[PDB]
Write a protein that binds this ligand. Structure first.
Ligand code: NXS
Length: 171
């Protein structure tokens, strides 16, 4: 059975319990913490690409009001994010299972941009998700996994200084 797990879930949980925030810029900002996934149960000899996208966790605009995050009252449908291809893709099961798959080069933007960058809506809450795509072989297959622990709000600057401090303490 294909097992997918979160490396350093203990650090992600420190961020989650304060409500995590991720900076988004015109040119795109890398994530801290970095999403790292432990994968076991692949065919060492089979071929896979690792994809990353962000699901809008709810249909609301959020705002930092008197030191607390609160959702707007007027939901809109959230068009899903674009997919980031892990640069080691495509690659052998063995490649993927030898060390945690780390998405350190994905950059989060707020502007439609050349590409590589993933555009998110500022002040929307997002749940990171991966697709492990079996490629090259005859029987194409996809396995998807969400990481609730890694939820954040996309912000142009940090609102909760407790987040600012955790980010600096552990980078
Ligand atoms: O058929 C598989 C899909 C096609 C695109 N993919 C890709 N592209 C470039 C490098 C690594 N992977 C993976 C998803």
């Amino acid at each position: 059975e294909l097992r997918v797990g979160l490396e350093e879930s203990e650090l992600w949980l420190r961020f989650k319990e304060l409500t995590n925030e991720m900076i988004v810029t015109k040119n795109g900002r890398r994530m801290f913490p970095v999403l790292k996934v432990n994968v076991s149960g692949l065919d060492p000899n089979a071929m896979y690409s690792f994809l990353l996208d962000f699901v809008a966790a709810d249909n609301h605009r959020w705002k930092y009001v008197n030191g607390e995050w609160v959702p707007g009252g007027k939901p809109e449908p959230q068009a899903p994010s674009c997919v980031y291809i892990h640069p080691d893709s495509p690659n052998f099961g063995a490649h993927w299972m030898k060390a945690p798959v780390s998405f350190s080069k994905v950059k989060l933007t707020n502007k439609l941009n050349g590409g590589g960058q993933i555009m998110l809506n500022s002040l929307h809450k997002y749940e990171p998700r991966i697709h492990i795509v079996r490629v090259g072989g005859p029987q194409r297959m996809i396995t998807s996994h969400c990481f609730p622990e890694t939820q954040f709000i996309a912000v142009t600057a940090y609102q909760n200084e407790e987040i600012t401090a955790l980010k600096i303490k552990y980078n």
